Amino acid sequence: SGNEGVIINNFYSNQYQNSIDLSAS
Amino acid sequence: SGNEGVIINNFYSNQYQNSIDLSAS
Amino acid sequence: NNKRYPYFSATNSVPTTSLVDYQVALSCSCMCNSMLAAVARNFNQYRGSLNFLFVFTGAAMVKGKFLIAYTPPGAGKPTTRDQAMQATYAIWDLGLNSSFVFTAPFISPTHYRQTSYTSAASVDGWVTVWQLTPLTYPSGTPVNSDILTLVSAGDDFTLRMPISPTKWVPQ
Amino acid sequence: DRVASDKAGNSATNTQSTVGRLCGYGEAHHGEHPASCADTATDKVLAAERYYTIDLASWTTTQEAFSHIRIPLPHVLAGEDGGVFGATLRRHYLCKTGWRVQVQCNASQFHAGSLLVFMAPEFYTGKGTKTGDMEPTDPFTMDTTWRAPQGAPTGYRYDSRTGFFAMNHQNQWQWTVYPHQILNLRTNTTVDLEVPYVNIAPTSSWTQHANWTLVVAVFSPLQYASGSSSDVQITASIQPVNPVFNGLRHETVIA
Amino acid sequence: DRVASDKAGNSATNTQSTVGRLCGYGEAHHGEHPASCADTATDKVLAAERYYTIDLASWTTTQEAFSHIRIPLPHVLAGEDGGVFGATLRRHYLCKTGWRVQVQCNASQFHAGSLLVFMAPEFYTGKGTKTGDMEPTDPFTMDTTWRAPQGAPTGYRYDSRTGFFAMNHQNQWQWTVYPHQILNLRTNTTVDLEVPYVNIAPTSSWTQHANWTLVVAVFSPLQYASGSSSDVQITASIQPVNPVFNGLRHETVIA
Amino acid sequence: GSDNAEKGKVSNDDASVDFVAEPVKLPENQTRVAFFYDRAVPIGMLRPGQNIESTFVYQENDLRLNCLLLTPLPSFCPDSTSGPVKTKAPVQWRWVRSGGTTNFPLMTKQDYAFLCFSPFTYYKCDLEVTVSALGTDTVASVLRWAPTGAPADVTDQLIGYTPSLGETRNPHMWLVGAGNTQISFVVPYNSPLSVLPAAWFNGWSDFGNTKDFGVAPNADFGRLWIQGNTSASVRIRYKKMKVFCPRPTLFFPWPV
Amino acid sequence: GSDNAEKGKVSNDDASVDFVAEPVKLPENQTRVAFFYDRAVPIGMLRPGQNIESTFVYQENDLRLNCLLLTPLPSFCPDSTSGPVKTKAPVQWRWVRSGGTTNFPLMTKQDYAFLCFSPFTYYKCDLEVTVSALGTDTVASVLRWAPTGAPADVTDQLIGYTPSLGETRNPHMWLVGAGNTQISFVVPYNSPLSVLPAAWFNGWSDFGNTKDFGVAPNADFGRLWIQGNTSASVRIRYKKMKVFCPRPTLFFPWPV
């Protein structure tokens, strides 16, 4: 969706690379 | 468990990267 | 003379004002030295219930009732049992069982709350303790009873974002 | 099993010497809407359905058998102490409710005495005769000082004469016929009562009628040896059971 | 089908020239309890869920394009005019609600002019700069006189200087991006709007934040030939949609 | 063609509706909130008040600070009837302000782009920060970061001849040596709030409602403190951005 | 509500127990012993007493040493009725101490964070060490490490014009050249003991019970010796940390 176009795009785990989305309810 | 979030996280063998856990008994 | 005790005292009277009053706020000072606060100061935010534990150490022959309350912000801190009674409260009756666990509910606009008095919204409401009825007893009994006051994180409770506290030096 | 707790919204009573909850007329206010009103009722207001805990009185060795204090309802909670309940009540023509009450009072194993705590429908709460009109004074206000019994409970006339009796007569020798419990210093520090909704009509024009009264009366005089804690209060936790409101309007200025 | 009625508790709006109800963000306040509060919320208070109808303003030939009036929420209904809703609101730390509004204003087929009626989140309601503190005045009060537009809508600084702009800037040329409707004298005498609950948090510390604002602004100036009825008011019926209250306490003295 | 604006909206047409014509639309993605804001932009710069060997201290110089607030919105040493209090950490301001007599530069720091164009009421995202050296000398620098609301712990050096800023469990960075000149990294949406105000917060920041109206509390991504021998340009980047409740953009001056 | 503290414990409630309310709990992991201590923190610094071309010798200077003890606990040249013996390798001390008159800096080295907050009696883990240059000159440096209890072998240069520290089979590091400025690495829990004392060891360190009470023997992760032209800040990091038998944290001063 955003301005990111790299295939090997993992290296750092997802949960580290980004804030964790979680729904209150 | 700890503060480590890298996928390709091996390179150095486990036994070299960390003290070896072993139970006396 | 401003020195600390693991407790507070009550007697055969109904003090027009409150007996003690804890400010629900990890940063808060009467907790300065509890494990709860000691851990909390190493984290940026919290969520959930705080549990206030009271233990009656006066004589077996002594009786009486207390009114423990939690007041959320918006209308200022309570100045009378009557007002306090309008917020979240519970009556504590002395008897065979020595203690009482009072829960300060986590009532808030935001999913989380900052753990520290870093700038100034100062607080998240107050916990106030009042006499409902006087401590009553017989002749031959110490007229002033001591109530141990402990605090701890309740069940719901959590902390997050590990950080460093403003450095300090023990006295 | 003498240890009990009762919760109501953000409030909770608690006792270690209970003797159970006496439920008057063997039943409770269910919160039904009144068949006499066309408008959909306002009900189930959590904020209004809790225990309002207040001061009743100071019990002393001076008070004698059958001295008492009268607490009118809803009136006593119609103002400030009634929080959201009183606030909502003040803005409605009609209210229909039950009551759940806990009266508190502790002393010691070395103290003697006993109280009659009860609830009565249509019980006289008038304070005195209003000089001029030939009517009572402050019917709807709670007694702020113990009331002496009548040697001959013939009630109170307003015509400034005496003789025979008045319809507001209340014969204490029989007060135990009302839903009640006894608070006995050697047995318990609390009493728990509950009453349904009763009245001359399906719902009430509260503004002008105190249909229920909470009465605390002395049976056997307070007693204690010198040295024993002399200061003894009587407080109470009062809760409106399933209040139902009708006829919303601009606010009645109890104030 | 331009004839419509809307009921809410013991209240009901009605119109013979409607153009429908514009529902902002394509959705409404469902009255869910806030995941951020542990205490069971007070909700569904019929007495509080109705239309409170009040005066907005007097529209005259003098007012020009983009002159406007700002109405803050819940604040404007937090006091007396808010009846049971305001009364309950004043006794709770937190409130979370949506709004359903009808703005009224009639003239004639011989009158000309048009209004922009809309609702915006976090819209500046400050009146003036408080001499001394470097802060606004009466943020939470409704405009009692039409507000002149800014030729260059750069907002309001409190540091008593000028230059660049303030975060409270509001560019009227784009006001139609907010949920709204247009009240056009030749077409309709009413507008109907509705908005959900939005905010920086799951529920609100209302006491100190007017998260929503009802704005009435002039687009094309009022006009009428001599002899034509010159007196033209603008009123409004405001209703709290599914208000939900938390953190019950002693009462905040709005007064 | 024919319609009615009154109802809050209107037919959103293309040529083919009123005329013997047709839709000329082509696929295209570059107009998306996320993608669009997902590029780097300068908000201010950092200037060291002191060595890599000493105790750090708030320091201003010609509008430059040894510490900065991570927010798109305008910021600076706290303002006062008597002038901005420069012995302190920057905070969120309610307006933009000229460094001096002429319009530029600015006394305040901020994402001017984001301000001139934030078509929305609330937003949220993670923040990617980049700190680039403005000078050419072999660099020796330390950078400290902290989440919104955290203690500044701007205390004394515990260990002599070393950087006080480095003395923390908080996320800190150590850069030194020829060719080693830029620091890059990303931090999480760390605010107590569910979403952030893109421009204005129509309420008081204190329970007493006497202070800082228009500014939401902890409405930022924390902050940066620097120390060492090198000044740096600081840019931010909106990661996985999300916006809500559309609103008007900054006004543009009508041609004389 | 009602309970009894006497028995050693009590009901651990949430709002829903005593009132018409409920559990507001959200998932969350950041409070874990392992994760929490798994971040870098400075314990001291290293200053070279001599060139990369000479024979190494213990050397102190304004509280700075050319050698350091790998432990969270306080350390320094061994103390003596007549003052700390600076011609020797640092050892574990039983208290923290001001470098001079005012509180700071400190004469002793240690993990101040870990001391102010170690809610436990014993611990263990591997130790990740980082050695960062404090200066900007092309670096020429050698670093020697050794496990707790090993011979210091602080002997003479065998080969002229070269670093004595480098002359060993022990793990040593050689850093040199423009842009080459930091050393990073990890060592194993190398102690003879099963677990380490987080704070205090209620016993004597010698069979004669006459010496060093409160300090457990070989209760450290070995040590570092340095030589060459560059001073460096030294930080440690708790790897796969484990703690046991909870205990009280460092006291905090009650507000006047």
Q: Outline the biggest β-sheet of chain F.
A: 5 strands, antiparallel
Number of strands of chain F: 13
CATH architecture of chain F: Sandwich
Could you say what the CATH topology of chain C is called?
A: Jelly Rolls
The share of residues in extended strands of chain C comes to: 35-45%
Strand % of chain F is 25-35%
How large is the count of helical segments of chain F?
A: 2
CATH topology of chain F: Jelly Rolls
Distance between the termini of chain F: 34 Å
PDB class: virus
Keywords: virus, Icosahedral virus
Entry title: three-dimensional structure of theiler virus
Chains A, B: theiler'S murine encephalomyelitis virus (subunit VP4)
Summary of the model, kept short:
Chain C is mainly beta and 171 residues long. Chain C has 2 helices and 11 strands.
Structure description:
Chains F, G: This is Capsid protein VP1. Chains F, G: It is found in: Virion; Host cytoplasm. It is classed as virus. The entry lists the keywords virus, Icosahedral virus. The entry is titled "three-dimensional structure of theiler virus". This is part of a larger assembly, with 2 copies of chain A (25 residues), 1 copy of chain C (171 residues), 2 copies of chain D (255 residues) and 2 copies of chain F (256 residues). By secondary structure, chain A is mostly helical. In chain A, 16% of the residues lie in helices and 0% in strands. Chain A is built from 1 helix and no strands. The longest helix of chain A has 4 residues, at 14-17. Helices cover 6% and strands 40% of the residues of chain C. In chain C, the strands form 3 sheets. Chain C has a 4-stranded antiparallel beta sheet, with no helix packed on it. Chain C has a 4-stranded antiparallel beta sheet with strand order 2-9-5-6, with no helix packed on it. Chain C is globular and about 55 Å long. Chain D is mainly β and 255 residues long. The radius of gyration of chain D is 19 Å and the shape is globular. The N and C termini of chain D lie far apart (43 Å). In chain F, strand 2 and strand 3 form a beta hairpin. Chains in contact: A-B, A-E, A-F, B-G, C-D, C-E, C-F, C-G, D-E, D-G, E-F, E-G, F-G. Chains E and F meet through strand 11 of E and strand 11 and strand 13 of F. Strand 6 (88-93) of chain C pairs parallel with strand 2 (11-15) of chain D.
Quickly list its features.
part of a larger assembly, 7 chains, D: 255 residues, mainly beta, Jelly Rolls, 6-stranded mixed β-sheet, 4-stranded antiparallel β-sheet, 4% helix, globular, F: 256 residues, elongated
